[PDB]
Structure 1
């Protein structure tokens, strides 16, 4: 094998479109833009959501809701993440050390996602009913 015997994988190097280079190419003389009008123009075309002047969908529908600031500092923890905490006890600080939750997370909940196979002590976190059953079947303990 040499610098002149190496080829890319088939289908990995599709050639780009080239508009306006004659009849045979299939893209001559209008470059796929069709005939006249706004969309045929250089720089032409309407903005996102524009509907031709009719009250667009994102304005004829009402706003709703508000954004929870508490939600942004609350995380969920899968059962599969319980083992990844090195030290045997799962709490906010150990979860943060293992990169499981964000640094600014203040509240955390263990849910029934994945599976747990070791006895772990969960401290200071909330735990769903199913996740608690799973942890306790794995010989673990949940301390508030």
Structure 2
């Protein structure tokens, strides 16, 4: 960071802070998943046991990854309006 003696870049520039303190416990599931959520019903949890979330997580989305195929029904979770399609498009259902 030192550059002679002048106010370092990480000095002259302001500091915009504030950390979610929540997004840390909010995962992001992808369409590439589910087909590995051990059978159907993508329970709020399960994914954890499926080793792809985190024992700490409390919230998560489905998002569009580009997969689904097998008819799966997410339970106790959220999902984009673009993912809540391919999901049902493959014979899936949403909990909410």
TM category (shorter chain) comes to over 0.9
| Unmatched tracts of structure 2, length 5 or more | none
TM-score (norm 2): 0.96
Instruction: Report SS of the residue matched to 2:16.
Output: coil
Q: Quote how far apart the aligned CAs of 1:114 are.
A: 2.7
- Report which of the two has the higher share of helix: 1
* Residues 65-144 of structure 1 mapped to structure 2, 5 A cutoff: 65-144=17-96
Unaligned stretches of 5+ residues in structure 1:
1-48
SS in 2 for 1:88: coil
TM-aligned CA deviation for residue 65 of structure 1: 2.5
> Could you tell me how far 1:92 is from its partner in structure 2?
2.5
Tell me how far apart the structure 1 counterparts of residues 83 and 39 of structure 2 sit (CA, whole Å).
20
Higher RCO by CA contacts (8 Å cutoff, separation 6 or greater): 2
Q: Give the deviation of 1:136 after TM superposition.
A: 0.6
Point out 4+ residue stretches in structure 1 off by more than 4 angstroms: none
The root-mean-square deviation of aligned C-alpha atoms, in Å, is: 0.8
1: distance between equivalents of 2:62 and 2:9?
Answer: 39
The size of the alignment, in residue pairs, is 96
